[PDB]
């Protein structure tokens, strides 16, 4: 399944997506490549759309 993220950061903004068997997956990927950006903020997810936010 497609996941997106929007990442909603003090120095970073956008869009990226992934191909992931769940949810619990595509955080994970999605969590290692915020913090390999330096994005450290609150997490949520709203399943209907399958998109996670990152806000810093």
Same mark, same amino acid.
């Given at each position: 399944?497609?996941?997106?993220?929007?990442?909603?950061? +003090? &120095?970073?903004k956008?869009? %990226? &997506? @992934?191909?992931? #068997?769940?949810?619990? @997956?595509?955080? +994970? #990927?999605? +969590?290692?490549?915020?913090? /390999? /950006?330096?994005? /450290?903020?609150?997490? @949520?997810?709203d /399943?209907? @759309? +399958? %998109?996670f936010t #990152? %806000?810093?």
């Amino acid at each position: 399944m497609q996941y997106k993220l929007i990442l909603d950061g +003090k &120095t970073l903004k956008g869009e %990226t &997506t @992934t191909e992931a #068997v769940d949810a619990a @997956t595509a955080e +994970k #990927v999605f +969590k290692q490549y915020a913090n /390999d /950006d330096g994005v /450290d903020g609150e997490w @949520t997810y709203d /399943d209907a @759309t +399958k %998109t996670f936010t #990152v %806000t810093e």
